[PDB]
Design a protein around this ligand. Structure first.
Ligand SMILES: O[C@@H]1c2ccccc2C=C[C@@H]1O
Ligand SMILES: O[C@@H]1c2ccccc2C=C[C@@H]1O
Ligand SMILES: O[C@@H]1c2ccccc2C=C[C@@H]1O
Ligand code: FES
Ligand code: FES
Ligand code: FES
Ligand SMILES: [Fe+3]
Ligand SMILES: [Fe+3]
Ligand SMILES: [Fe+3]
Lengths: 193, 447, 193, 193, 447, 447
């Protein structure tokens, strides 16, 4: 639908992603995706990190959040690394992070943190070549409160791939977030978006 | 407050007044006496290799444009238009032959010169002396093996001399390894801490690693994992500490080439570093060749820190007394295979980046220590840095600088803060030199 | 699903609540709950407080919002009152609050306040023992603006029980919120979450 | 349902709008509206402004966002212009704004801005007199990030009318927002709500 | 500003400069002359009854740990590590025998002593004088019938003497009723007001109740509901006002035992209080027994306020000139049945807590009055507190203190502010005493 | 900083220190010497036409109530209660005979007088001198053809004299057109800029229009669209610039009656303005009649700006050195048909309102130029305003004031800043006059 020569602000990646949802919409798939994401967010909000891994995350997962350097709209010569990886985790790396969260000597976890996630704008479409692969897009507002008066709110769009695995359960096999704020004003990005 | 007379840092740098982490008037005074006077990290050759390449960087609270000239040198200029003061460049990196101001259209070259003014002939005639309207230029720009530093003060010592005794320690990795490259772009995160908190932590704080990072050590299975929860004493001779005249200092942890990297990278690194060390033995000697594959936690005064081997490179950019913007880059050896470079960079961010699980352990420590500095009953209290005092040496036959022959101590805090008092109480470099004429004696006193 | 001995950060209460939604999911009940909550939020947003009471709130309601004291992750000896009640209202107490809102001498209500609510993550399940009782969970972002430049945003998860009453209309019989920020930075918590 | 003599804080306009959704609810229309708004927000989020115009916006559109002056709850004599129009655009005026966004000399657009929209509380009902006119109400949180550390978040309720036009595609023919913050603390309101 | 000479509060406390609610330099000066010098509420025995029990509290902008010792006494210490200044305790309440710093692992006992340092022998040898490194201790900690106050100034009068003439009024409820307990945890909310705004409001503002709280009175159907919208004159002799030498003061509203509590609790309270009053008549006399079931709106200088009978207990914690953190507890009589205690506590929060519908009525009043204090044309303007001046008495035969024999007046503002000028213009307690040698004469002048 | 001696603005207003846009101590000093001394826009007759009508407005950081009296005059008062300092009125506009304070119920009339105090007889008796407790009144309130300005300083010149030579330029549109009305309510948006940035921009910045607004010009197809991207030189004699003694100044762009309005309104406006111009030729002369349909970009010192013809009317309300609250109204000619008035008002907001696409172009320029003023290396740098210096004239036979006979120059910046130095370095109006005795000579020097 989008012609990126006329819609000059639109990236090729973005134009490709949109195409995959405007075509045949499947109301029930949208509903399945809504349920998957709501249950994932519930598990994360109550800090059931082991359960999240066991029930929502696939063994072949790529969990990636990037921070893209600010470059000129008209930049065309400078070609060096465009972004850095805030997260770029395989399942084992996610497990390490989960173990870090659950360790009793993680002093930053006492008193207990409070998380609240808000998931919106869910879209879902099956992949054209892998019929077992489901593309899910959603936006998330994540609120984190700790130590009386620290409050950080995160905002992002998530491009996910989910696939049925062990026991027929649909699990996350890829999550990609291009984090919108270049300089984080939230102390850190130590949250699972 | 009279900074000529106020003792902010006691003799031998044994203690500092807690207010130094919270006082805004002192922060303003540091802009002048620390940040406008000393050497500050800008960038690396690897980030601006070709003519016209540029990045923006902070120098204290000021923003500068750092640009590769046609002749191969690098010049840096205030990122501020000479007409009405608008910020000239709004991106972080790019390639260009000049910069045009979006307010009234003045165009400056990569060399800082005012090159064009819209309708100059019709409006200004010949009245505009463009030669006098070039961007305000950073007086000094020098390189340390590819790492580019700037200094607003023409009277500063050369960067190599400024690095003092710390240079000897850095050279194996920075020079004899074949060279480093910085992998950008950096992570950027604001923390609610004074810039000195992480600076002091990186310059000489091995004591905190076992306790502060207990969870990360245990979870990541890195080479230092035995320290988790202060479970294990580190061996006698596991390292040392050093400091220098101009404030730079570092911890040395022998052989820890894989550093904070989780077990997935430990074998490859340890193999890579050991092979290089073997060839270096013949070129620079056993001791220095081993320094090359030993983990150095260093601060280059005032606000640039790094963990060699681990590959972490930080700039603690000052915003105000309880606000700092943390920039995090990865440093890699140029002759490492590309795939390993890529993975090391991810590991650096994984551990010490915006979502660095190690870096998160330190957040509360730095933020609360800084914020406590504003609290009434704490302002005049003394932060202690006396661990190892009276066992440090000067002029050792093998390890240069003021040196503590132990892995864990506060030698480097003392040298950092002795340099900090001397600057804050001095008006220029000559006075700093006069205040620093007996620096190593002040530091080793009771030994 | 959750074993709280392994998922060390998860409370027993939270693990119990999750169990009640992961089991048989009923797509139409999720949709009924979505409608109920959207209409409730609309009534509240336009300040139709009497209508809210008449149409959304059951005579036996318990409307409760707590603030839990920050205690050590490893605390096990100190056993005194764990939280305070910001709200713990029966229907009559809610009516008093509604009368306070509508009184023409409530000076704080002039000029008129502006509310906008965002309800997300809706889950619904029938109770196992009371077949007339519906469990609904949802998250809310509530934006309050007044007097030119005052803006307060509230974030919370709501554990509700709703039951059919007068005329067959499903009404709120219990709302429980464990407010995530310990020290409020919003001037007050004078809003119906 | 609402009697505005008893629900003293409720405006006549608001009471009228609510009536149009409490009556016959049509589950599929709610779902169609959800899809329309999600796709609109996606196009806007990726800055496909030309596509948005072509696919989401009707030729007879009225796109209006007002800022209402703060007046006394009890005001009844002062009768001068109650609000100003932040937006009150026809299709051509929207096109001008879109051209301004895409112009390569719009310096404020380099480096590229980042938008994330969160659409919630969707309600939909057919008009009683024009059977081709669909009334859609939704709330939006719009997050805008630029230049490293500028972050602005907008909050609003949207009263829309959408109608099938060219090719049978449902398009926006009226959007009305009464912006809740009187004094904007977001630098400007240069975003399409 | 010269606080020795600046008249911030006029003679007899008849007016105050509006800037006192907005001036940040004055706020900084109050940290020294008000908060570091006077008695501040910490906690109640009921909250830390067993050995090892602790809470954190603010004292001005400082945070302290308040801990029940093995011998039954209570000691309080700055919540700041003696090494590098990190905040030691991050929770609000707990039970423990010591506190370990998460930065480098130093461990302090409940008694403040430095008890352990990781690897002390290997790192410090015998060089660390732990005896000198205990947490900074609050000099004075005293109890008023279970209510624990602290003072950083060793020279302060004893708390009982500090309460002065106000103590006589509090004793029926605090002592003769059998004792009170504080029900925690408190509500905590930040408001954009100066701490003095709610403090002055609670110390002597009955005038605002009918108008400010018109909506709550009418809606809740509480015993004071007839005042709604200044509809009804309160009877002659419905109460009085009092103030004292050290600034504490209160309003007395005869017989209002159910206080702000809505009709659902009025009958039970009125019965409970009346029964106790009957037994108290024989022990302490009719007058004091009635004071016991009379509603006292009191401020214990400087920033602790309360409404007896209603059971509201507040700490107005200072953050900056236009920011205060409000802590709200419920006070209950220990011999009340448990179910009634529970319901009274909910009612206190319902009315005066974070969502207190009464407390909300006061928000705009306090916030705007404070913020107006920063506005240029208002800084030098005079806030008036002259209501009842020249009718107050000293040394009455029955009611002690400087007393206004009327329910509504500004007697208590005048005493609060006379005490405030004396401190702000004084360097120590001795000078305050000298400035206060004719306090009651200054207050009753024209009578 | 000593504002008697500090040269903030160089001779002839050729340059200004960048710190003037960022220094908070200077901001505080401006409250006194700029905002408490000079004339500030309040409202228009069209907004408060009937007795009892009122609006609130800012005067510097102070808030005032501006009310139409029964006798038809307008009085303005601080929006602050005389009792305890609460903000009296919380709405923006209304109609009433008085204002009652929601704290303790004091009621003041539309004329500022304290008219009622609850329970006055019972509480105050006859002790309250109400005559002395009226709201603090703005000393001076004057009108310029319906536009109402206030001044806290009784010694200020009359508004007409204050407008100086600028008045001659405004009169064709403000007086000879039949009169203007302001269409409210205004848009209100906070920007992170110093109030002087937009003020200087509107007073004399035509140079930026082609470049800053390239995108809007090209997109809107307005009459000035040929300037887009500095594509086109504006003709010789396309306009002029002027400035005056008390700082007010403006740009004149001949015949640009449709101004920034997009093509949808250009034909109707150009017809309307041309018809009026034809009748005005006979009444006021060809030159002034043409000034009437010429686009004036004017600032009325210090912080009120406007674009005649375009119909944009702005107040740059100061909050702090890098914060301003922008109020945006539309100005229309009273004899325009109603439908055209409605459409012009929408067009004003469309272009210059809260979502004004033109106004958005200027955001980065103003915000960064202001914020750069706080940066250490920029504080002492010089903002340039020398364009056209030495070609300006005084006492021209046809165009009054210090005048630059060219459309694009910096004449008006120089006059604005010469007036600003004179005030900031002066203690009162008499000293300003003494400092301004040779104003036009200082401005035309080299000519
Ligand atoms: O956590 C780090 C670290 C890791 C490993 C070795 C030394 C250090 C010292 C300072 C850094 O914070
Ligand atoms: O609103 C309160 C109150 C209620 C009831 C009696 C006196 C008072 C005085 C101060 C408090 O603000
Ligand atoms: O952008 C404006 C403008 C438009 C058209 C003519 C002059 C001006 C001068 C200042 C304003 O910023
Ligand atoms: S501010 Fe840069 S050209 Fe004018
Ligand atoms: S700061 Fe507490 S042990 Fe070091
Ligand atoms: S503050 Fe206005 S009546 Fe008391
Ligand atoms: Fe660390
Ligand atoms: Fe009150
Ligand atoms: Fe402009």
């Amino acid at each position: 639908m989008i012609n990126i020569q006329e819609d000059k602000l639109v990236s090729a990646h973005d134009a490709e992603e949109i195409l995959r949802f405007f075509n045949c919409h499947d109301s029930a798939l949208q509903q399945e995706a809504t349920t998957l994401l709501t249950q994932e967010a519930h598990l994360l909000d109550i800090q059931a990190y082991r359960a999240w891994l066991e029930h929502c995350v696939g063994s072949e997962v790529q969990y990636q959040v990037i921070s893209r350097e600010l470059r000129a709209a008209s930049e065309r010569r400078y070609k060096l690394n465009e972004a850095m990886n805030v997260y770029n985790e395989n399942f084992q790396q996610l497990k390490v992070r989960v173990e870090h969260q659950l360790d009793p000597q993680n002093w930053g976890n006492s008193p207990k943190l409070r998380f609240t996630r808000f998931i919106t704008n869910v879209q879902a479409a099956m992949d054209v070549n892998d019929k077992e692969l489901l593309h899910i897009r959603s936006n998330v507002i994540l609120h984190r409160a700790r130590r009386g008066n620290q409050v950080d709110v995160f905002y992002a769009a998530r491009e996910d791939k989910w696939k049925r695995g062990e026991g027929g359960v649909r699990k996350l096999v890829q999550r990609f977030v291009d984090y919108p704020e270049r300089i984080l004003q939230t102390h850190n990005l130590m949250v699972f978006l | 407050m009279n900074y000529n007379n106020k003792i902010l840092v006691s003799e031998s740098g044994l203690s500092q007044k807690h207010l130094i982490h919270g006082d805004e008037e002192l922060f303003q005074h540091e802009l002048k006496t620390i940040f406008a006077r000393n050497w500050l990290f800008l960038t690396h050759d690897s980030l601006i290799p070709a003519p016209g390449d540029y990045v923006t960087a902070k120098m204290g609270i000021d923003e500068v444009i750092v640009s590769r000239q046609n002749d191969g040198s690098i010049r840096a200029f205030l990122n501020v238009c000479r007409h009405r003061g608008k910020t000239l460049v709004s991106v972080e990196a790019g390639n260009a032959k000049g910069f045009v101001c979006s307010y009234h259209g003045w165009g400056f070259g990569s060399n800082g010169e005012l090159q064009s003014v819209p309708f100059e002939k019709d409006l200004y005639g010949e009245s505009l002396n463009k030669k006098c309207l070039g961007l305000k230029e950073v007086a000094r720009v020098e390189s340390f093996h590819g790492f580019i530093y700037g200094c607003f003060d023409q009277e500063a010592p050369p960067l190599m001399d400024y690095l003092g005794d710390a240079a000897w320690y850095l050279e194996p990795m920075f020079k004899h390894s074949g060279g480093l490259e910085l992998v950008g772009p950096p992570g950027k995160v604001v923390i609610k801490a004074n810039w000195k908190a992480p600076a002091e932590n990186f310059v000489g704080d091995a004591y905190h690693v076992g306790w502060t990072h207990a969870s990360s050590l245990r979870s990541g299975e890195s080479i230092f994992s035995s320290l988790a929860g202060n479970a294990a004493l580190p061996p006698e001779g596991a390292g040392l500490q050093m400091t220098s005249k101009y404030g730079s200092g570092m911890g040395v942890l022998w052989d820890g080439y894989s550093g904070v990297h989780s077990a997935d990278l430990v074998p490859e690194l340890m193999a890579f570093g050991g092979a290089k060390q073997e060839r270096l033995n013949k070129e620079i000697g056993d001791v220095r060749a081993r320094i090359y594959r030993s983990h150095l936690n260093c601060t280059v005064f005032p606000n640039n820190s790094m963990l060699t081997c681990s590959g972490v490179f930080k700039v603690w950019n000052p915003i105000d007394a309880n606000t700092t913007e943390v920039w995090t880059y990865a440093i890699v050896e140029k002759d490492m295979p590309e795939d390993l470079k890529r993975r090391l960079a991810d590991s650096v961010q994984r551990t010490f980046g915006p979502a660095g699980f190690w870096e998160s352990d330190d957040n509360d420590n730095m933020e609360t220590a800084s914020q406590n500095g504003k609290k009434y009953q704490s302002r005049d209290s003394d932060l202690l840095s006396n661990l190892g005092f009276g066992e440090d040496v000067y002029g050792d036959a093998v390890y240069p600088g003021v040196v503590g022959k132990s892995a864990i101590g506060e030698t480097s805090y003392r040298g950092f803060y002795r340099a900090y008092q001397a600057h804050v109480s001095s008006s220029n470099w000559a006075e700093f030199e006069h205040a620093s004429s007996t620096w190593h004696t002040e530091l080793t006193k009771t030994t």
